[PDB]
Design a protein around this nucleic acid. Structure first.
Ligand SMILES: Nc1ccn([C@H]2C[C@H](O)[C@@H](COP(=O)(O)OP(=O)(O)OP(=O)(O)O)O2)c(=O)n1
Ligand SMILES: [Ca+2]
Ligand SMILES: [Ca+2]
Ligand SMILES: [Ca+2]
Ligand SMILES: [Ca+2]
Length: 901
DNA sequence: TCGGTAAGCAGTCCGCG
DNA sequence: GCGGACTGCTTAC
């Protein structure tokens, strides 16, 4: 097989590399890598190396990496550019793996671990590590085994061995319900003392050294705790055995309001799953506890135990250990679904970076562009310092707040990357500038044509047309990968709908789910077999189709995020290719494109309808337009349609056969106007929305920019078994909105769009009547909580204290002196409830850590004093009033003359 | 929360005769 | 009470 790296590090003048050799074996080597950098040289001097602007360079080969770094410093002292890859390990990888990396995940040791630490005096601080580590569960992907290290004797209690037999039993038999599929994969090791546990753990680590190390909060808790605990018991040299090169560094992670420490383990790639999830999931969750995320992702119940976690080991060591094992498995289950590790490996190896660098789009693109340029013996520029400067972004149309009955949306494919490719925007393709007119003048095609030679953006920039820039070349590659995965995602989505349809008529039989590839549209034969399947088999197929769709979503959305990240990196001062001329060339072209096509779409539809000056485009945001289709439907007449699916088909055909060609003609003209390199503005129909045929539903409404709701029948070619609400921006979509209130507001919206005003009024009256019975957690608001200290003046709110921070201060006073009470963690999320006048907490609200029950010490009092009236007004009535006033509807029945009978 | 801009709403403070 | 200046937070792209 072709070799591939696992990890790479620079330690002084050596590169330390772990890799898989040509026989599939893991190896380690230390290489005295001699880096090269570059200086500009005279034109009359033969070289094969040129900078990106075509200026010749001489290569400087250094005796060692320290010499190279010192040279960079002296070049700064002199005032001359030091060119080339200054991150020497990326240069090493580029020299050592000068081909597209083919990696084999089965050879990569991926470790998932979790530790338990009993602590009587609150949260066990990793930098102190003053409490024994009393359990470690460490799953190894190569062995496919859960290694359980269990401390039986501690100063906080002596316990009996954990029983795998009890662990396997149902909770109803007094068991822990450790899933049967992992029972035979557990290797259980009890220890008489913590010193022996840790020594054995280190020997095990040495034998089975993680390449990728993950788990939940491992980077912020488990790793620093284990490192510091071993350091405290045994000394530094022993703790450094967690690094295969025996090198570690305390790394200070700074943010706006403070800092924290992590431990860098040289020769390991730490991908904390909480951070993978935050980056790649595209969710914003009210809590990031593993129990909360597990329930969200997997629909598994919370891990149930009695009493505080600080007393769990002593009271129920059996459950304590079982829950540590289950916690490790939950992360593997989330990964089996989401496939974030797979994604990270794919992107890291593609870019030729340390796998952990996938967190940095700047590092990722720097490496991609570097490797690309190096292929042509081109030399990258030195990074420079720049002041942070604001720059303009997208255009968003102000909508007229209203109901909108029939709506068709259109959207540009991968807009910013398409602009980069169309215009040819790159550091080395800048050709010059032209005299800019107001943007309105380009939108309306009255400005002078910018150039007859170069490709232009309405910000004034011109670009070469003779050859593709490196940024367009490399962005196109990732764009093409993204397109492939999005195809698989949409097919799985369409396949899911076929199964949902068939589930209306399940057959009474015993059978099996069909063996199919859900990434490809089902054939006629498959469709025929599906129509004969039982509900059991159909539901199993639906689950599998949906898992396929999720895997496709992960692969496609994050490749989209990467290419959009390159457009944004051009506006980040730390990017080697930072240039506000290029960043603004993209965003300004985007503003023009949207408003240009708004004009063209209005012109086309006014022509087909035989009107002038009427506004068909009701809204647009960045790259999408929303078109009122009422007049199109009305030209046919609602009476002429058999059912909802009939007018949806008609609009689908109208959009594909009439509107899309008009839109294409409009953009081809714009391409010629800007003299662009290649026409790539591809705007396709996105959604078809409207009320069910014959109903009183309103179809859709807008309240303002980035705030609307539509009843969608077809989305990007997926014809839904049942209409789907597309709600953007409204409170139903906000993590700050209470869970039960999101649900209620969504149903109000469903009723508005699908059934009408009377149905909405019926539901509102019931909710208002019953909501006080809702569980307190389900009606609590949620907020991130920053700067608790800033607003804390003797335990009371300082000037301008935010509402949620006020709540935290109330909580802090209520739990004062109690060492065991859960503390609110700066920067994390809290639940917030309003409190009625004259409550014993002395303030108008209280807040406590999100994802948790409020402590038993004050729970009773919180429940008794919760202000349900304020809660309802603020989270439910106020947003609903906004929806209904926009839609010109009443949520309560107005008096009429009939009341007189 | 270590890792592009536009723009919405909640809440504080305080004016507005 | 409602709006502007401002902070804080959270979305849509
Ligand atoms: N984090 C983000 C999200 C979006 N955008 C910009 C660039 C996108 O091209 C544009 C429109 O975003 P969309 O969500 O409509 O997605 P794209 O058009 O990029 O992709 P798709 O092909 O899915 O429509 O907004 C951005 O700069 N950064
Ligand atoms: Ca735990
Ligand atoms: Ca788009
Ligand atoms: Ca059937
Ligand atoms: Ca869009």
């Amino acid at each position: 097989m072709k070799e591939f790296y696992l990890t790479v590090e620079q330690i002084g003048d050596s590169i330390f590399e772990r890799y898989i050799d040509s026989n599939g074996r893991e190896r380690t080597r230390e290489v005295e890598y001699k880096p090269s950098l570059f200086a500009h040289c005279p034109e009359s001097q033969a070289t094969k190396y040129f900078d990106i602007y075509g200026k010749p360079c001489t290569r400087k080969l250094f005796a060692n990496m320290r010499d190279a770094s010192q040279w960079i410093k002296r070049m700064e002292d002199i005032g001359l550019e030091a060119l080339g890859m200054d991150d020497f390990k990326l240069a090493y990888l580029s020299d050592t793996y000068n081909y597209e990396i083919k990696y084999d995940h089965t050879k990569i040791r991926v470790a998932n671990f979790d530790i338990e630490v009993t602590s009587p005096d609150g949260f066990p601080e990793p930098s102190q590590a003053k409490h024994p580590i009393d359990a470690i569960t460490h799953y190894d992907s190569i062995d496919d085994r859960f290694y359980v290290f269990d401390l039986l004797n501690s100063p906080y209690g002596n316990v009996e061995e954990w029983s795998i037999e009890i662990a396997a039993k149902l909770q109803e038999q007094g068991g822990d319900e450790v899933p049967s599929e992992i029972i035979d994969k557990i290797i259980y090791m009890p220890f008489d003392n913590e010193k022996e546990l840790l020594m054995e753990y280190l020997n095990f680590w040495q034998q089975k050294t993680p390449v990728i190390l993950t788990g939940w909060n491992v980077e912020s808790f488990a790793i620093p705790y284990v490192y510091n605990r071993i350091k405290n018991i045994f000394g530094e040299s022993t703790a450094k055995r967690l690094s295969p090169h025996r090198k570690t560094r305390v790394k200070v992670i700074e943010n706006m309001y403070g800092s924290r420490e992590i431990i860098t383990l040289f020769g390991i790639s730490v991908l904390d799953y909480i951070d993978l999830y935050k980056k790649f999931s595209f969710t914003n969750q009210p809590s990031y506890s593993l129990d909360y995320i597990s329930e969200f992702e997997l629909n598994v119940g919370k891990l149930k135990y009695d009493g505080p976690i600080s007393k769990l080991r002593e009271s129920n060591h059996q459950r304590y250990i079982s829950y540590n094992i289950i916690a490790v498995y939950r992360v593997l289950q989330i990964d089996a679904k989401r496939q974030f590790i797979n994604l990270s490996l794919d992107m890291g190896y593609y870019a030729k970076i340390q796998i952990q660098s996938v967190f940095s789009p700047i590092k990722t693109w720097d490496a991609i562009i570097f490797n690309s340029l190096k292929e042509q013996n081109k030399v990258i520029p030195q990074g420079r310092s720049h002041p942070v400067q604001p720059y303009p972004g997208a255009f968003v149309k102000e909508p007229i707040p209203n109901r909108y009955k029939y709506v068709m949306s259109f959207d540009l494919t991968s807009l910013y990357p398409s602009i980069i490719r169309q215009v040819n925007i790159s550091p080395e393709t800048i050709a010059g500038t032209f005299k800019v007119a107001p943007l309105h003048d380009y939108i309306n095609a009255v400005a002078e044509r910018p150039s007859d030679v170069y490709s232009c953006s309405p910000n004034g920039m011109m670009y070469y047309k003779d050859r593709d820039g490196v940024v367009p070349t490399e962005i196109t590659k990732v764009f093409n990968q993204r397109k492939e995965h999005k195809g698989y995602m949409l097919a799985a989505q369409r396949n899911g709908e076929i199964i949902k349809e068939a589930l209306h008529n399940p057959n009474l039989s015993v059978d099996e789910p069909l063996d199919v590839d859900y990434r490809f549209d089902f054939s006629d034969e498959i469709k025929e077999k599906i129509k004969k399947l039982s509900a059991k088999s159909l539901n199993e197929m639906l689950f599998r189709a949906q898992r396929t769709e999720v895997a496709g979503m992960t692969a496609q959305i994050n490749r989209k995020a990467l290419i959009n990240g390159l457009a944004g990196a051009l506006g980040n001062v730390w990017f080697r290719y930072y240039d506000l001329r290029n960043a603004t060339a993209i965003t300004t072209f985007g503003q023009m494109a949207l408003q240009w096509i708004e004009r063209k779409v209005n012109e086309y539809l006014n022509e087909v309808c035989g009107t002038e000056g009427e506004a068909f485009v009701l809204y647009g945001d960045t790259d999408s337009i929303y078109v009122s289709a009422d007049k199109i439907i009305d030209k046919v007449g609602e009476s002429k349609f058999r059912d909802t699916n009939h007018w949806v088909d008609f609009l689908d055909k109208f959009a594909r056969e009439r509107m899309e060609p008009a839109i294409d003609r409009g953009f081809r003209e714009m391409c010629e106007y800007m003299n662009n390199k290649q026409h790539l503005m591809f705007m396709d129909r996105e959604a078809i929305a409207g009320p069910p045929l014959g109903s009183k539903g309103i179809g859709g409404f807008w309240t303002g920019k980035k705030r609307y709701a539509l009843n969608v029948w077809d989305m990007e070619g997926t014809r839904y078994a049942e209409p789907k609400l597309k709600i953007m921006g409204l409170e139903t979509q906000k993590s700050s909105t209470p869970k039960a209130v999101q649900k209620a507001l969504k149903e109000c919206i469903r009723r508005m769009l699908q059934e009408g005003e009377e149905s909405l009024q019926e539901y509102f009256k019931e909710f208002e009547k019953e909501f006080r019975q809702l569980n307190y957690i389900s009606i609590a608001s949620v907020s991130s909580a920053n700067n608790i200290a800033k607003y804390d003046v003797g335990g009371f709110p300082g000037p301008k204290c935010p509402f949620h921070i006020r709540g935290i201060l109330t909580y802090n006073r209520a739990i004062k002196g109690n060492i065991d009470a859960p503390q609110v963690v700066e920067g994390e999320k809290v639940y917030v409830l309003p409190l009625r006048e004259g409550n014993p907490f002395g303030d108008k609200c209280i807040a406590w850590p999100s994802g948790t029950e409020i402590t038993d010490l004050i729970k009773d009092d919180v429940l008794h004093w919760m202000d349900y009236t304020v809660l309802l007004e603020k989270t439910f009535i106020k947003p609903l009033e906004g929806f209904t006033s926009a839609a010109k509807l009443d949520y309560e029945k107005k008096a009429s003359l009939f009341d007189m009978f």
